[PDB]
Chains A and B, each alone.
With several copies, the nearest count.
Chain A
Amino acid sequence: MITRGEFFMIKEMYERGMSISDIARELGIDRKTVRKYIHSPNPPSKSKRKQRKSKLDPFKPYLQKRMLEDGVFNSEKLFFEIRQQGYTGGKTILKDYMKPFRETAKKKYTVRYETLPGEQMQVDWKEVGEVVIEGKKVKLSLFVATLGYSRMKYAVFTTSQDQEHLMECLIQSFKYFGGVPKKVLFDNMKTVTDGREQGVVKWNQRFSEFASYYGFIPKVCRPYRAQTKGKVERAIQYIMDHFYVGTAFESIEELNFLLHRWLDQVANRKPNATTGISPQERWAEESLKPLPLKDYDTSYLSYRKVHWDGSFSYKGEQWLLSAEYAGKEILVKERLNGDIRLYFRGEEISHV
Chain B
Amino acid sequence: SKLPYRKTIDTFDFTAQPSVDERRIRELLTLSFIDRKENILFLGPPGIGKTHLAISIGMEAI
Name the residue of chain A whose CB is nearest to the CB of B51: A209
Does B35 sit at the interface, judged by CB under 8 A? no
Compute the total of residue contacts between A and B using a CB distance below 8 Å: 28
Given A297-B11, A331-B10, A333-B10: A346 in contact with B4 (beta carbons within 8 A): no
**Do B8 and A301 have beta carbons less than 8 Å apart?**
yes
Does B30 sit at the interface, judged by CB under 8 A? yes
0/1 interface trace, chain B 1-31, chain A, CB 8 Å (1 if under): 0001110111101000000000000100110
**Which chain A positions have C-beta within 8 A of B10?**
331, 333, 343, 346, 348
Count of A interface residues, CB-CB < 8 Å: 13
**Do A209 and B26 have beta carbons less than 8 Å apart?**
no
**Which chain B positions have C-beta within 8 A of A95?**
none
**Which chain A positions have C-beta within 8 A of B6?**
301
**Contacting residues of chain B (28-58) with chain A, CB-CB under 8 angstroms:** 29-30
**Do A343 and B5 have beta carbons less than 8 Å apart?**
no
**Do B5 and A346 have beta carbons less than 8 Å apart?**
no
Given A205-B4, A206-B4, A209-B4: A346 in contact with B11 (beta carbons within 8 A): no
**How distant is A220 from chain B, measured CB to nearest CB, in Å?**
20
Known interface pairs A205-B4, A294-B13, A343-B8; 6 further A-B residue pairs with C-beta atoms within 8 A, sorted by A's residue number: A301-B8, A331-B10, A333-B10, A345-B9, A345-B30, A345-B60
Interface pairs (8), CB distance under 8 Å: A205-B4, A205-B5, A209-B5, A303-B59, A343-B8, A345-B9, A345-B60, A346-B8
Using a CB–CB cutoff of 8 Å, the interface residues on chain B facing chain A are 4-6, 8-11, 13, 26, 29-30, 59-60, 62
Using a CB–CB cutoff of 8 Å, the interface residues on chain A facing chain B are 205-206, 209, 294, 297, 301, 303, 331, 333, 343, 345-346, 348
